[PDB]
Design a protein around this ligand. Structure first.
Ligand SMILES: [Ca+2]
Ligand SMILES: [Ca+2]
Ligand SMILES: [Ca+2]
Ligand SMILES: [Ca+2]
Ligand SMILES: [Cl-]
Ligand SMILES: [K+]
Length: 994
């Protein structure tokens, strides 16, 4: 809908056939969506490259390798047996392979950039729009907005796309389009056209350019364009290409792609030397330089086979797929390069309120009397679940569920909780969460009655707005609150005067429900309600009550307690003066203690266990807060930062105590601290500084400009999703819920996104080192060659390239949080890991130069046989010493090389199955965990059988199809790799790390 600035509002509403009263419709959305794409700008420009030097090392090798195959046959294309066809088509083979190496190398290149696209649902404009389905506004993602739908914007909003204003709801509408125009002041917009189709944006006084924000006003409009069709979109697309610095894992990995290339470049250039003894020999046209181009091919080939390809792309996938994974968990990563650091987090600094704690008061404990006949009374203690103002949760006794209604004592406790209250619950259908109305401590009660629901009302069926104050209303339908006696610090309590509702009488049923702080309320109780009874307040009982009120108010939970009682025979309203707190303490006498409830601000979901997790992963959790030292210290023993009876007289500090210490004592405080209370805004940054001094990677939560500095200085800034825009742009990550338990998970995924890479690296390296050992172990202990040029190319393609990319789809490893956080100090590969590599690779290479050895040497019923004097085979000429029913041309036999190459491939897939997780079992994580692997394995295992059995080919590959016994061998020869590595894993899993 270009040039919408020159068209009537009608011409546009028409062009989209949308009614501005109800905006678009589902199918219109999907329709326009497909025709114009999502409201985003792509990455069509170059902003990424193949970090490794070797990727450009190999591509030159496969080019020059081909050259050798064009000089090879050419120099002398005529042999005694003209052209065997298995040395004539080689040029046609390698090239047929480089093509496969390509089709594959670009297969993984896509997934790598296909996953990037998966992460395009981050922190967008969230523009507002009107669609058919609903009548009220719709806060939808900026990208989900299609040209054509109806968008409205009020003060402060950011313009999500190019909008042709339709209606201006405010007396006027100024906008700030400073970012796109030479206009510093906000300008006005109007609802009419601007005929001239080629006028400049400054003169498009009726449009709202995307990426702009309105200074003042509200106004509806219709999206002309979106995406790159946007005025700001035609700009950013046409911008200067951006460059970047590099991360310590990239550096350490580039240093790695420098070690290998070199070594490789010598493991092979050492082959064109260990095989000098065969350059002249017959098999190679019986000339020198001709063999000097055959062993060249092998080396330049062995290289290609060893060069672990795919790393850059694969990482980018784990990375991508992982971030996707984090987001599902509310961890919106803003900087990919940072997720790298994320697993090196060694200290998290979090704020208490909202993040570690819910900040919604919740009753979690309550009791009442059970028995008292024997001058020794027991009680009925109940626990309550659910830690917010939402009606969700259930009453428990001895960790077991019970109906609140079955206990008559509770029915009154609720009646009090229900009536002696001035607060309520409200469902904010907008935010889809339960809100409180008034004081929290009261509201906490409200929610208790709901979780109680002593009268088994039907709730499930009700609407959220309905479940809000359900059970609470029932009680109000049975008891009329006449008047209330306001609070007062003299008696520290309050109460109400109630009487049966609808009851058309007086002086009957009247009761006064009193609620207050324990002591005082208990001392005004002369009677104590048991069952439905009421026995006088003896000396022993009153002791029992106060005893638990202590066990509760002091214990690890440190619950705030409230005493619930009723005045059975209240004075009459007449004889009562309600205009001074002075007399109220009096009317509130001769009470019958009903029960007590204990509330507290509960720790957010999982936070209690997440802290335990950090603990297992050596991460320091430091709580920053506004509380007082004492209460703050408490909250820490409540959540776990501190054991219930752990001495922490030096790991909690308050702003002032801290400023009072000397720099050297401040730095020390931080290497041990775990709680900070009443902190000046400038302490966070100071705290981090001291944290950095002990080389500690630190994640700091913030939520206001107040934290901007601290957020930036930290290794990882983490902004509250409920925070300010400033803090969000200062952090490298955002908490959608503002929950602490997230950070811990984000951190964990970091550990997996690393471990994934390590699975990928280990599989190539361990496997390829195994190839290089076969080519070597034959040329070593002297043996009939096991592989030739095109076979190396084959193996490469079948075990690098595809089942390799697969692993990038491996899932999150386990017991990944019991190690200390990674330090950018320690090396890419640990000495034991390298062993673990050679342990494997050294084996595979054996199994291969031990599969053909089984073909040549004895074999249950083998088609050929000889003895370990096979190491001298080349001197065979029927010399009459080691001769039998054998001919010197049996050392050219195809099946051996085929019993080999087939062992290689199958052994590697058996190995790729080991790359599902660094130190776990195939038992604890089956091969089917990652499907794409099983797939890629088969898709390759197949390309192998196809080369062996499809007659026009096994000839080119100098191979010769093996039978069911010849394949049952390959299995028992390669399958035992699982067995081995499964041991190394076992070891490490218990002996090494601990
Ligand atoms: Ca008009
Ligand atoms: Ca390779
Ligand atoms: Ca440092
Ligand atoms: Ca391989
Ligand atoms: Cl108009
Ligand atoms: K930073």
């Amino acid at each position: 809908m270009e040039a919408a600035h020159s068209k009537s509002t009608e011409e546009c509403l028409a062009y989209f056939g949308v009614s501005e009263t109800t905006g678009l419709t589902p199918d219109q959305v999907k329709r326009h969506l497909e025709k114009y794409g999502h409201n985003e700008l792509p990455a069509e420009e170059g902003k990424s490259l193949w970090e490794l030097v070797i990727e450009q090392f190999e591509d030159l090798l496969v080019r020059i390798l081909l050259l050798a195959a064009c000089i090879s046959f050419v120099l002398a294309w005529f042999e005694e047996g003209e052209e065997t066809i298995t040395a004539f088509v080689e040029p046609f083979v390698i090239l047929l392979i480089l093509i496969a190496n390509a089709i594959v190398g670009v297969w993984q290149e896509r997934n790598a950039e296909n996953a990037i696209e998966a992460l395009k649902e981050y922190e967008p404009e969230m523009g507002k729009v009107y669609r058919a389905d609903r009548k009220s506004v719709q806060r939808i993602k900026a990208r989900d907005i299609v040209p054509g739908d109806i968008v409205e914007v009020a003060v402060g909003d950011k313009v999500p796309a190019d909008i042709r204003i339709l209606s201006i709801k405010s007396t006027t509408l100024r906008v700030d389009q400073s970012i796109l125009t030479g206009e510093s002041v906000s300008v006005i917009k109007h609802t009419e056209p601007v005929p001239d189709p080629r006028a400049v944006n400054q003169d498009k006084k009726n449009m709202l350019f995307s990426g702009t924000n309105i200074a003042a006003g509200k106004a509806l409009g219709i999206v002309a364009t979106t995406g790159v069709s946007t005025e700001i979109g035609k700009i950013r697309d046409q911008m200067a290409a951006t460059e970047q610095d590099k991360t310590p894992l990239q550096q350490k990995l580039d240093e790695f792609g420098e070690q290998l290339s070199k070594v490789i470049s010598l493991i092979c250039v050492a082959v064109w030397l260990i095989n000098i003894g065969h350059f002249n020999d017959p098999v190679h046209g019986g000339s020198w330089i001709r063999g000097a181009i055959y062993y060249f091919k092998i080396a330049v080939a062995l290289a290609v086979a060893a060069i672990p390809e795919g790393l850059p792309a694969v990482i980018t996938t784990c990375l991508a797929l992982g971030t996707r994974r984090m987001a599902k968990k509310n961890a919106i990563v803003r900087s990919l390069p940072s997720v790298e650091t994320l697993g090196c987090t060694s200290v998290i600094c979090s704020d208490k309120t909202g993040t570690l704690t819910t900040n919604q008061m919740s009753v979690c404990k309550m009791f009442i009397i059970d028995k008292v006949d024997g001058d020794f009374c027991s009680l009925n203690e109940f626990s309550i679940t659910g830690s917010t103002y939402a009606p969700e949760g259930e009453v428990l006794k001895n960790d077991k569920p019970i109906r609140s209604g079955q206990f008559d004592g509770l029915v009154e406790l609720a009646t009090i909780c229900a009536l002696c209250n001035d607060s309520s619950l409200d469902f904010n259908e907008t935010k889809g969460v339960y809100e409180k109305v008034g004081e929290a401590t009261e509201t906490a009660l409200t929610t208790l009655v709901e979780k109680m629901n002593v009268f088994n009302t039907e709730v499930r069926n009700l609407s959220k707005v309905e479940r809000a104050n359900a059970c609470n209303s029932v009680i109000r339908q049975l008891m009329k609150k006449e008047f209330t006696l306001e609070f007062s610090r003299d008696r520290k309590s309050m109460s109400v005067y109630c009487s049966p509702a609808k009851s058309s009488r007086a002086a009957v049923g009247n009761k006064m429900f009193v609620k207050g702080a324990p002591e005082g309320v208990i001392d005004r109780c002369n009677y104590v309600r048991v069952g439905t009874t009421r026995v006088p307040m003896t000396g022993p009982v009153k002791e029992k009550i106060l005893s638990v009120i202590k066990e509760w108010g002091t214990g690890r939970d440190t619950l705030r307690c409230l005493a619930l009682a009723t005045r059975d025979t209240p004075p009459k309203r007449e004889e009562m003066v309600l205009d001074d707190s002075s007399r109220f303490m009096e009317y509130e006498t001769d009470l019958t203690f009903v029960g007590v409830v204990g509330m507290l601000d509960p720790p957010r979901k999982e936070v209690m266990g997440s802290i335990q997790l950090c603990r297992d992963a050596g991460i320091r959790v430091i709580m920053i807060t506004g509380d007082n030292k004492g209460t703050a210290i408490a909250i820490c023993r409540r959540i776990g930062i501190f054991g219930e009876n752990e001495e922490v007289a030096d790991r909690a500090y308050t702003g002032r105590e801290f400023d009072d210490l000397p720099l050297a004592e401040q730095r020390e405080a931080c290497r041990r601290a775990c709680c900070f209370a009443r902190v000046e805004p400038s302490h966070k940054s100071k705290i981090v500084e001291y944290l950095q001094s002990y080389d500690e990677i630190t994640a700091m939560t913030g939520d206001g400009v107040n934290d901007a500095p601290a957020l930036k200085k930290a290794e990882i800034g983490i902004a509250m999703g409920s925070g300010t825009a400033v803090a969000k742009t200062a952090s490298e990550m955002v908490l959608a819920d503002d929950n602490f338990s997230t950070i811990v998970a984000a951190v964990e995924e970091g550990r997996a996104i690393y471990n994934n890479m390590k699975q990928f690296i280990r599989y190539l390296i361990s496997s390829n080192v195994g190839e290089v050992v076969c080519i070597f172990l034959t040329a070593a202990l002297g043996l009939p060659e096991a592989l030739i040029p095109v076979q190396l190319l084959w193996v490469n393609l079948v075990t690098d390239g595809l089942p390799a990319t697969a692993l990038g789809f491996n899932p999150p490893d386990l017991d990944i949080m019991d190690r200390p956080p990674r330090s950018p100090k320690e090396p890419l590969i640990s000495g034991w890991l390298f062993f673990r590599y050679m342990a494997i690779g050294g084996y595979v290479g054996a199994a291969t130069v031990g599969a053909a050895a089984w073909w040549f040497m004895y074999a249950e019923d083998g088609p050929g046989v000889t003895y370990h004097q096979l190491t001298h085979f080349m001197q065979c000429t029927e010399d009459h010493p080691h001769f039998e029913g054998l001919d010197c041309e049996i050392f050219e036999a195809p099946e051996p090389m085929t019993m080999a190459l087939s062992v290689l491939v199958t052994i590697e897939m058996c190995n790729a199955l080991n790359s599902l997780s660094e130190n776990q079992s195939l038992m604890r994580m089956p091969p089917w965990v990652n499907i794409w692997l099983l797939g890629s394995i088969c898709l390759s295992m197949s390309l192998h059988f196809l080369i062996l059995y499809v007659d026009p080919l096994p000839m080119i590959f100098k191979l010769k199809a093996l039978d069911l016994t010849q394949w049952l061998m390959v299995l028992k020869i390669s399958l035992p790799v699982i067995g081995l590595d499964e041991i190394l894993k076992f070891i490490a899993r218990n002996y090494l790390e601990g």
